[PDB]
Amino acid sequence: NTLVKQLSSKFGAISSVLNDILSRLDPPEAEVQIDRLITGRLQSLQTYVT
Amino acid sequence: QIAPGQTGNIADYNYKLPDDFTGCVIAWNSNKLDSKHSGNYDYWYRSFRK
Amino acid sequence: SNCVADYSVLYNFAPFFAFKCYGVSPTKLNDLCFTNVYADSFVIKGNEVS
């Protein structure tokens, strides 16, 4: 439940929904917002697996 | 206007760089070489496109 | 409100000194882009544009 609920967090991004980031921003900024979301999800997956 | 992530008549219809472009854009004032009092037909922009 | 906004007209109205967007990038404004639209119009000095 915790791992799924972490998907709703922004982790510093404008929006927690990946499709909103791709729709609103051009590639060079969207990549930064995505990298922030990736970092947050990577932390959540490593915590879950550990 | 000649830069990654830019928009306008040139970025949109004449010269576009990739958004992961690397390299240098060098610019200088050429008023004493290109200017003509009657104008110069040879220089234009596409200004419309599909 | 209740308008099908088309943003290419801004480029038709004038060349611009600045066009900085936060949370959205140019050319992505032709998808759903606004909810409650407010346009704040004012005159400032060039040194104060930043």
From Swiss-Prot, chain A:
Task: List each coiled-coil range.
Answer: 1-34
Q: What does this protein do?
A: Subunit of the fusion protein that is processed upon entry into the host cell. Mediates fusion of the virion and cellular membranes by functioning as a class I viral fusion protein. Contains a viral fusion peptide that is unmasked after S2 cleavage. This cleavage can occur at the cell membrane by host TMPRSS2 or during endocytosis by host CSTL. In either case, this triggers an extensive and irreversible conformational change that leads to fusion of the viral envelope with the cellular cytoplasmic membrane, releasing viral genomic RNA into the host cell cytoplasm.
Task: Spell out the protein name for this chain.
Answer: Spike protein S2'
Organism expressing this protein natively: Severe acute respiratory syndrome coronavirus 2 (2019-nCoV)
Please name the gene that encodes this protein. Answer: S
Span within the full-length protein is 960 to 1009 of 1273
